[PDB]
Every structure is written in C-alpha cells, then in structure tokens.
Design a binder for this molecule. Structure first.
Ligand SMILES: OC[C@H]1CN[C@@H](O)[C@@H](O[C@H]2O[C@H](CO)[C@@H](O)[C@H](O)[C@@H]2O)[C@@H]1O
Length: 349
C-alpha cells in the first residue's frame, strides 16, 4: 500500500512506563512526585511534594487518559493506537534496571501491545546506580536474551538499537572496551552486537573525539528545549550531520513540541519553551528534516513532568492548579502533527 499512513521505522518516540495508579500499582506513582530543591537556592529548603491527587499531579499539563497506570493493558492498547496515529514506528522505552517483577511484567505487556499494531520497541538505557560498561554489557545480554525473539523487538539491518542517556558519565576508555571491535568485553561480532547511540551534549571540540574514541555507532540529542545544550540547538544540526556522515555515524536528532517542568522544578523557568499552537514543534521538526538525517527521535511521547509530551492532554482547572493545555488545538493535535512530519520526513528520505 501507498496511502501515506504507514508506520515509520526510523522514527523513535521516547516512552516512559513509570506511571501508576493506586488500584493497579498501590500508589499513583509519578503522578505524585517530589519537588526538586533549587540547586542555587541555599540550605534548608523543604520544597515538598506533589501528591498525585486528581487535582494536583506532577505535570504542568493534564493527560486525556487521566492518572493512568503504565501496567494497565487497556491504557497500553490506547497508547499503541496513538503511536499508529502519529506514524511513529519505534517506541524507545525508558529502562532503569529496577530488577523487579513489576518492571518485568510491564515490559512484556508493552511488547505484546506494540506487536498487535506492528510497533517496534527498543530500549533507552538510563543512568542507573553504578552503571558501568560491564553491567551494561550484562544488561544488554539480558535484554536481547529475554526480548530479542519477541516479534516487536526492534532491529535495524539485523541489529538491535539502544539509546544511552548521559553517556558522558562514562569515560571513552571504558566505552572502548565494550564498543571497539578489539575491546576487552566487546559486543562487536557477537550475538549481542547493537547500534549504540550516545547522547551528544556539548561542543564539537569535546563531543567529536568522545564519540570516536568511545566507538558509538551514532548519537542523539534528547532535550526538547532548543538551546539547552549545543546538541539541542537545531541550527547546529546540518554541521552535526555532516560530521556524522564523514565519520560513519548515525545522527538521530531529537525534536519536541515544547518544554516546561516548573511543577517539579519551580526554579527551572529559563528552560520553558512555549508550544505556540504547534509552531515550536513545526520549527524543530523542519530543522531535523532539513539536516538530511536518516532517523529522528521524538522527545517525548509521555514525559509529563517535563511538558514535552505529544500524548493527548485536556484542559483542566482544579482547586489546586490551573493546567496548561493544547490551547487552540485539539487534544490529539500533536499526534496528527507528528504524522504530518513523518510524511515530510519520508518524502525526503
Ligand atoms: O529519559 C531521559 C531523561 C529525560 N528526563 C527525565 O525523564 C529523566 O529522568 C529524571 O527526571 C525525572 C523527572 O523529570 C524523574 O522522575 C526521574 O526519576 C529522573 O530523575 C530521564 O533520565
């Protein structure tokens, strides 16, 4: 078929599975969240917590689906239908190495639901405690062993793909052990080889040798807020792509519809990026496509704390907070606008 509605398997949407309800999980997990103290605000702060009541949740926006559980198979069905509407073929699942049965259950449910809609799943490896290249290898082996034969497990030209958040927390000399073909604990040429996509943060003078010396297969930028880092400044994307092509690396720029995290980080208002009825998202997505990249990542499906979500949001005013909403746009606007951009991306590919 050539309908302009099919999923794109070079489009990765960052997905969070940490939401809970009292009924399913025992607590409205993540809807309730600690408020971060101001890192520049001195001692004795007692910032408090957002309780995750119906009236007061840990987001500046409010989900159409309410205070949902990421373990609810019925929510997962709805999310997969939202991915189909957005044309986003790959769900990039946050992974925190919780080593708990409720994690394991959730991952299986997500894979199952994704497969019903021909969506694929890859893992976004977060900065879990004592993360290092040895336990990363062990975890990559575990994930490929547990999930690699699931029909929804993502591969690109035969290889799994992992995004590695805050990959700069690990020295290139350690990464080389895992990612060079000659490395002491290499995954190259093994059953556990994968495309490893590191987080490009700062200036080229630092990041170019880091990526090369660490032997990453590519890089992404994550942040939805333009200008937060060099990497998340879209005017740099043409030159980042040129370098990537010259050095055999895969650049997967991250685009998002806005940013606001001031319910949980009230001191972080300088990072706010206004959605302007979709114009911010359009500008950022256009820059990614114009850079001539092979793959794009979306920050985010549902990082509600950071206000980067494309998941449907609804107007809501409670006695405790007046939420932001999609303003002049309908709740599913960011899903259908994603589909528009996926089409433009495919037209350019
Ligand atoms: O997925 C990468 C990165 C994206 N921003 C945050 O989701 C971050 O997690 C940390 O912040 C959230 C609140 O925004 C918090 O709930 C988590 O426990 C982390 O501290 C992700 O690593």
């Amino acid at each position: 078929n050539n309908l302009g509605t099919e999923l794109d398997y070079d489009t990765f949407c960052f997905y969070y599975d940490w939401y809970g309800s009292e009924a399913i999980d025992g607590q409205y997990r993540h809807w309730a969240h600690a408020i971060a103290p101001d890192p520049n605000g001195g001692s004795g702060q007692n910032p408090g917590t957002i309780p995750g009541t119906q009236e007061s949740i840990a987001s500046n926006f409010y989900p159409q689906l309410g205070r949902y559980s990421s373990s609810d198979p019925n929510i997962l069905t709805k999310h997969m239908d939202m991915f189909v509407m957005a044309r986003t073929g790959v769900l990039a699942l946050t992974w925190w190495n919780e080593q708990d049965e409720t994690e394991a259950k959730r991952i299986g449910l997500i894979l199952d639901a994704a497969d019903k809609k021909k969506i694929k799943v890859c893992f976004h490896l977060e900065p879990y405690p004592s993360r290092n290249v040895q336990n990363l290898r062990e975890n990559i082996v575990k994930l490929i062993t547990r999930y690699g034969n699931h029909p929804a497990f993502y591969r690109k030209d035969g290889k799994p793909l992992f995004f590695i958040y805050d990959s700069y927390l690990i020295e290139p000399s350690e990464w080389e052990k895992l990612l060079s073909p000659g490395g002491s604990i290499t995954i190259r040429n093994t059953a556990y080889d994968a495309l490893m996509i590191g987080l490009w943060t700062s200036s080229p003078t630092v990041q170019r040798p880091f990526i090369l010396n660490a032997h990453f297969d590519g890089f992404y930028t994550y942040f939805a807020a333009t200008g937060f880092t060099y990497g998340s400044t879209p005017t740099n994307w043409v030159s980042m792509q040129k370098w990537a092509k010259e050095n055999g690396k895969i650049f997967i720029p991250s685009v998002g519809p806005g940013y606001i995290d001031t319910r949980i980080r009230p001191w972080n208002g300088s990072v706010i990026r206004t959605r302007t009825d979709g114009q911010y998202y359009d500008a950022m997505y256009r820059k990614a496509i114009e850079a001539g990249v092979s793959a794009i990542s979306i920050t985010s499906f549902n990082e509600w704390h950071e206000g980067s979500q494309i998941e449907p949001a609804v107007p809501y005013t409670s006695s405790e907070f007046t939420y932001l909403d999609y303003e002049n746009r309908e709740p599913d606007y960011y899903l259908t606008r994603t589909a528009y951009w996926v089409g433009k991306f495919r037209e350019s590919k």
